[PDB]
DNA sequence: GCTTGACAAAAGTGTTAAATTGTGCTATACT
């Protein structure tokens, strides 16, 4: 009840000494994109597509659909044999060896440091 | 010197009806923000109390109006009403001005715009800018009329995206990630990518 | 003078001090013991005035009543390092048919000073008209005090008022009727909010002192009054635009009952000084002629101020029109007042230093400041000491009593500067009453130390001490002499949010072993621990709503088997360029009951210490006013040393210019020599002319002598000269400066000396709080603000500069368009453009062109909300917006 | 986003214009839930009207991935963009 | 290389019981 009473305070207001600056001005807009990040996240991708292609044409396309990589939304392992025309165990067989051969060092060191 | 004003209109296209305004547009919520504090407080913007005057009144004014109240109580939200609207936009420029908590003035849109250090004259034309950097000056004599002495931490952080790509092309660090971190911890392997 | 364990510090003083110092903490003192009304203030009043004094709480109830009466209060509910400890307030509850309880009452330390809500707070008094200057009043600590109690007890009858009226009579008491909300209210919005109350500015003893006493002019006016002499001291002022509003008070300054100020006068009846000294406001100083303080008296017995104008009572001694601050400037009466101002000023502005070296040539004050200032532990009764430990110090009475003091050790002040108190004392030893125990933090055997005597040369070096830079030996680095500590605080808290409730553990989401190799189990930095920019001192975690991650990064999950954790990480890193050790930690859990804010469940603050070398581009001064940066360091090898092979450790140029003068520095630079040589008048047949004046003391002295020259009755130039005569040799008897105060320095570089003899000695000079560590930012990429997109200094660091209005008019001036725009876009408000710009530099492709800087999207939006219809207007597309 | 633009022109907003302007007439003097502390529906903040508060979002959660853009949610009336429009779009009020 | 039926967990979906929330109301007389 007590942080139910409190009320808001002014970002209009005037923190800085003699109107240097408003309070509103020190306010981190922390979605704002992170330059940095958007370079690493576009290298990341670029070095997942390289190691897609190590794998199966079909096995890559599984890894894509099971976590959505091409279209953004993930697939259950019914979908995605549905796709393939397969039972949904038949994808979860064949995802399990994907991750295998993915945690191979060859394929896999690299992308360690992308934690 | 009133025919400048009537010339204006009839030389351009606007109708005077512009002057009274039926609807009122409601400025976007990001510039207009509230979000909780560090510390657990909430702040937010004066817009927000201005805003929520003006569509107190009016809507009270419509229950009046279908209540059938008398022109009295109507007159006077419809006083009230166009008070809040005058707040909304250039607040205190007549009567006393709507203060809140600490009887401090609200910042309306026209404070909101002009002001020394308002969006106006110098935040908009005024504003702080990424690679940068200050520190105390000391005499450099030995220095060259072209040159400046510039503090090897002022520089490093300052070509930071530089370094990060040399020391890149470089076989010191396999990808950039790992090149932030060996010039964040200021690894000694820089200083030779940075001169 | 006249204080038991006082060090030997020879005066030049040609007159006696006829009155001692008043407390020259009384000022805060009185005021707030007359407020609540405290049997010693009855006790002193009643003695010499009314048999009936009046408390300013109880004046305030005899006016209110008939609408309360016989106020009470209890004892302090925690001690003052207790308050500080738990960020809590310093008061007394008090009370008052139906007994009511009316609030905690904030308290007054033995230091003048309060404690609200953990940190310590000075009350400035204010200085108010009761048109002409002795029209002014000066409004006292405890009687604005009252003032604001006045509003809240009249407020408080105003609705007792309403109260009693709609409710039923004989069915309500003095508690339903009584509403203290108000009066409470009113004290905790004074204190806190107030322009008078103030956080007590505290690096240096001497700063906080000067805080007290303190007074507000206005309640033409800036400049100084006649009525002022004795009263405010004109010669201490703020620089900025504030100057004649804010001023000291006096040294011998006393305040009446009232508030009018007093100055102590000694009546002078027939040409004879009386040493009747007496209370004479503003207005009874025109009564009676005043004589002026440096006087010609002969031998037993024997310029004034008249009524309303310049040049029957005289005097009580020089400085009366001087304050502490500027009574500590030797040789004051020959610096500009400029300088003057400028070098009290920079006094208050010193740091504490680790060794805290006393002044080799001081005033008179130093003794006296520094005892009073409340920094330093002094002994309340004669006796001897029985333990004497680095923790505490315990002295055995002759009485039998058995006091002891605890001592405070690298204790944080308000700026992060490091208090140390250092015993002075062993076991056996015998100290009386009033004595100095321990040292504070600029202070040595009782006397403030607010800098370090140094071997100085006035000789332009090759352009590195060019204007007002300073070149330093690096033995300064090596011995440490101009080292101090300096302990930070940083602080995080654990409450309940919107979603969840934040938990501090040490379990970071996406962290290596190593970076957690200092934190302990619960995710808090350890104890001892060194910590660079960036490192993790607690570990905190937030809850964090729907996930909903990016792909790309699921993918990794799966493949590196690190299950996707479900909330956010948010730990206390150190701000970008700070560094230091970790000295202590205060975790405030919830568990532990406590008393935190509603939500908070646990709170911890970690103090970082730092121990900062004198480095290149730290601030220097003098008491004379003279600063400037460290240009150089140059290695003691190559430096102008004195024939021994003594090299100098700091250069001066000679910064004053003819007419500029800046003469005071000069002068304590040879006194500086002549107290670290000692001095013989070889007196054979009398003594010289000029020693006539001199009293027998300063005729001989051995090395390393402290000196005394009070500020206007000090050492003459007469006098000087001939101590320059005097120095005794070093080893060997080699004579190292001659009368005239120079020497031949050898270049430590080329190896050959210096064409001509340069002007050597000691001057005592300070480390101010500018420093460059922290003066020093970079930014090449951070945090921007909400609202407006502009690079906004996150609060661990990395903020923006500004490319202020003019400088844009400068750009525009080169004509260099691209620059400008570059830094108006891109390099700011550029949502997309910052982001593509590191993005290219970091490729290693040519920066992109510049789009719409956020600003003027902004303005657009702010026009439109004020139904200004505003279109950007293409030369052939219409109508564009912005999206 | 040109960058290059001939003019600047102003003129005074017609009732008409900012209704064209407005995304949806704000009809409360409300802010966010004092609990839930999110942009209630029909005031100020609304999410209906002024934006997303989370990129791809709709209130409710029907839609979340980024997979459907452009369309907007047939419960919580929230379309499906950006964040950002959150500072770009402008409401209206409809005067008695 | 793939599928079957088991089984489970997880995700929904419809049905109910708190709880949360909004509105109406209080008659000495009171302007
Ligand atoms: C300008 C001013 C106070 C300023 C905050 C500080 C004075 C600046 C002058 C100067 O230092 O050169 C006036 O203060 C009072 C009422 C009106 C004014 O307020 C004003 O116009 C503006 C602010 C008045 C009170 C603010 C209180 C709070 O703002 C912060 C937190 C709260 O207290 C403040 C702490 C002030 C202590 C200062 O102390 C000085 C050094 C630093 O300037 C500060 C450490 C010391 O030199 C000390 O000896 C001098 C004290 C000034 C005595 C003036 C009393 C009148 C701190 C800035
Ligand atoms: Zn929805």
């Not at chain 1, 038949?90 to 896999?108: A, C, D, N, V």
């Not at chain 3, 903490?25 to 004094?53: C, K, Y």
């Not at chain 3, 031998?299 to 310049?310: A, S, W």
């Not at chain 3, 240009?631 to 090898?637: A, Q």
Request: glycine residues 8%.
């Amino acid at each position: 009840i007590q942080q139910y009473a409190r009320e808001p305070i002014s970002l209009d207001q005037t923190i800085g000494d003699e109107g240097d600056s408003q309070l509103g001005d020190f306010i981190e807009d922390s979605e704002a994109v992170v330059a940095v990040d958007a370079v690493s996240f576009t290298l990341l991708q670029d070095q997942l597509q390289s190691v897609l292609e190590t794998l199966s044409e079909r096995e890559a396309g599984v890894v894509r659909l099971r976590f959505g990589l091409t279209d953004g939304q993930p697939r259950t392992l019914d979908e995605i044999g549905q796709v393939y025309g397969v039972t949904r165990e038949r994808i979860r067989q064949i995802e399990s060896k994907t991750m295998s051969k993915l945690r191979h060092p060859s394929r896999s060191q690299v992308l360690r440091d992308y934690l | 010197k009133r025919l400048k004003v009537v010339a204006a209109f009839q030389q351009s296209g606007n109708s005077p009806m512009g002057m009274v305004l039926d609807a009122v547009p409601v400025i976007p919520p990001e510039l207009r923000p509230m979000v909780q504090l560090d510390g657990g407080r909430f702040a937010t913007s004066d817009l927000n109390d201005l805003y929520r005057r003006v569509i107190n009144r009016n809507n009270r004014l419509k229950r009046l109006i279908d209540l059938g109240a008398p022109e009295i109580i109507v007159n006077n939200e419809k006083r009230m009403l166009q008070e809040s609207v005058d707040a909304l936009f250039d607040n205190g420029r007549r009567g006393r001005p709507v203060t809140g908590p600490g009887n401090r003035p609200l910042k309306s849109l026209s404070d909101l715009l002009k002001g020394k250090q308002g969006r106006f004259r110098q935040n908009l034309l005024g504003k702080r800018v990424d690679y940068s950097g200050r520190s105390v000056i000391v005499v450099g004599p030995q220095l060259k009329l072209h040159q400046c002495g510039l503090p090897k931490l002022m520089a490093l952080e300052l070509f930071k995206p530089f370094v990060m790509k040399r020391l890149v092309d470089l076989n010191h660090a396999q990808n950039i990630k790992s090149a932030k971190r060996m010039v964040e911890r200021q690894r000694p392997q820089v200083w030779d990518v940075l001169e | 003078n006249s204080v038991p364990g006082a060090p030997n510090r020879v005066s030049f003083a040609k007159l006696r001090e006829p009155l001692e110092v008043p407390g020259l903490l009384d000022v805060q003192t009185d005021s707030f013991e007359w407020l609540v009304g405290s049997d010693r203030w009855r006790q002193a009043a009643i003695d010499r005035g009314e048999e009936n004094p009046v408390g300013g709480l109880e004046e305030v109830l005899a006016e209110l009543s008939p609408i309360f009466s016989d106020p009470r209060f209890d004892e302090v509910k925690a001690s003052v390092d207790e308050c500080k400890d738990k960020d809590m307030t310093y008061a007394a509850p008090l009370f008052v048919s139906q007994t009511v309880f009316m609030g905690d009452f904030p308290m007054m330390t033995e230091k003048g000073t309060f404690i609200i809500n953990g940190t310590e707070r000075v009350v400035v008094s204010q200085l108010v008209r009761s048109d002409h200057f002795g029209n002014r009043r000066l409004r006292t600590v405890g009687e604005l005090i009252q003032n604001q109690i006045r509003v809240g007890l009249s407020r408080m009858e105003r609705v007792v008022r309403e109260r009693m009226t709609t409710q039923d009579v004989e069915a309500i008491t003095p508690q339903t009727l009584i509403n203290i909300r108000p009066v409470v209210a009113a004290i905790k919005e004074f204190f806190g909010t107030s322009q008078l109350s103030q956080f007590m500015d505290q690096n240096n003893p001497l700063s906080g002192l000067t805080h007290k006493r303190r007074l507000l002019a206005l309640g033409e006016v800036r400049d100084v009054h006649p009525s002022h002499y004795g009263r405010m001291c004109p010669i201490e002022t703020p620089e900025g635009p504030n100057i004649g509003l804010i001023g000291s008070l006096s040294v011998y300054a006393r305040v009446n009952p009232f508030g009018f100020i007093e100055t102590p006068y000694r009546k002078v009846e027939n040409g004879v000084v009386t040493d009747q000294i007496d209370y004479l406001t503003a207005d009874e100083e025109d009564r009676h002629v005043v004589a002026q303080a440096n006087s010609p008296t002969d031998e037993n017995g024997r310029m004034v101020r008249k009524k309303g104008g310049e040049v029957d009572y005289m005097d009580v001694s020089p400085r009366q029109m001087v304050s502490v601050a500027t009574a500590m400037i030797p040789f004051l009466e020959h610096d500009d007042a400029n300088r003057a101002l400028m070098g009290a000023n920079m006094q208050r502005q010193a740091v504490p230093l680790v060794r805290s070296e006393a002044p080799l040539v001081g005033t008179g004050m130093e003794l006296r400041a520094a005892i009073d200032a409340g920094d330093v532990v002094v002994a309340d009764k004669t006796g001897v000491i029985e333990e004497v430990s680095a923790d505490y110090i315990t002295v055995m009475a002759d009485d039998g009593t058995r006091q002891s003091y605890r001592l405070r050790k690298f204790a944080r002040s308000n700026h992060g500067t490091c208090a140390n108190q250092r015993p002075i004392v062993d076991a056996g030893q015998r100290v009386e009453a009033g004595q100095v125990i321990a040292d504070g933090p600029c202070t040595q055997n009782g006397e403030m130390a607010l800098g370090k005597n140094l071997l100085v040369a006035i000789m332009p070096w090759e352009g590195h001490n060019y204007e007002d830079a300073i070149i330093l030996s690096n033995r300064l680095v090596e011995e440490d002499v101009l080292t101090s500590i300096h302990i930070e605080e940083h602080e995080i808290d654990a409450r309940d949010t919107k979603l969840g409730a934040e938990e501090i553990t040490r379990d970071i989401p996406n962290v290596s072993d190593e970076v957690l190799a200092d934190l302990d189990e619960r995710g808090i930095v350890r104890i001892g621990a060194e910590v660079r920019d960036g490192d993790i001192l607690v570990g905190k975690v937030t809850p964090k709503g729907e996930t909903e991650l990016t792909p790309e990064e699921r993918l990794l999950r799966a493949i590196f088997g690190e299950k996707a954790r479900e909330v956010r990480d948010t730990s206390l890193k150190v701000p970008h360029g700070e560094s230091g050790k970790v000295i202590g930690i205060r975790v405030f859990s919830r568990e532990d009951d406590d008393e935190l804010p509603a939500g908070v469940n646990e709170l911890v603050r970690v103090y970082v210490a730092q121990k900062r070398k004198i480095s290149d581009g730290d601030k220097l001064a003098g008491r004379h006013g003279n600063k400037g940066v460290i240009g150089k360091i140059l290695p003691v090898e190559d430096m102008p040393f004195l024939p021994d092979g003594t090299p100098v450790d700091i250069i001066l140029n000679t910064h004053g210019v003819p007419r500029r003068m800046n003469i005071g520095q000069i002068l304590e630079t040879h006194l500086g020599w002549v107290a670290k040589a000692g001095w013989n008048i070889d007196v054979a047949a009398g003594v010289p002319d000029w020693a006539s004046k001199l009293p027998e003391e300063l005729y001989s002295a051995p090395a390393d002598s402290t000196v005394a020259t009070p500020v206007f009755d000090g050492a003459q130039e007469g006098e000087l000269a001939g101590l320059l005569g005097s120095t005794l040799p070093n080893r060997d008897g080699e004579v190292m400066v001659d009368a005239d105060g120079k020497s031949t320095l050898f270049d430590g570089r080329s190896g050959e000396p210096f064409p001509y003899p340069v002007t050597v000695g000691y001057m005592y000079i300070l480390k101010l709080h500018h420093l460059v560590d922290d003066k020093i930012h970079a930014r090449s990429t951070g945090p921007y603000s909400m609202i407006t997109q502009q690079p906004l200094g996150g609060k661990a660091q990395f903020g923006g500069q500004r490319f202020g209005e003019m400088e844009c008019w400068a750009m525009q001036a080169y004509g260099a368009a691209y620059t400008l725009q570059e830094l108006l876009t891109i390099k700011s408000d550029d949502t997309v453009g910052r982001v593509k710009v590191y993005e290219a530099i970091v490729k290693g492709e040519n920066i992109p062109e510049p789009g719409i800087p956020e600003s003027f999207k902004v303005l657009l939006k702010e026009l439109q909300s004020l139904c200004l219809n505003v279109e950007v207007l293409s030369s052939d597309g219409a109508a564009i917006e912005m999206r | 986003d040109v960058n290059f633009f001939d003019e600047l022109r102003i003129g005074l907003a017609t009732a008409d214009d900012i209704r064209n302007w407005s995304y949806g007439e704000v009809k409360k003097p409300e802010t966010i839930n004092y609990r839930t502390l999110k942009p209630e529906k029909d005031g100020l903040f609304c999410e209906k009207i002024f934006g997303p508060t989370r990129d791809w979002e709709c209130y409710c959660g029907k839609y979340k991935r980024v997979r459907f853009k452009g369309i907007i949610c047939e419960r919580c009336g929230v379309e499906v963009t950006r964040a950002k429009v959150r500072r770009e779009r402008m409401g209206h009020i409809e005067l008695a």
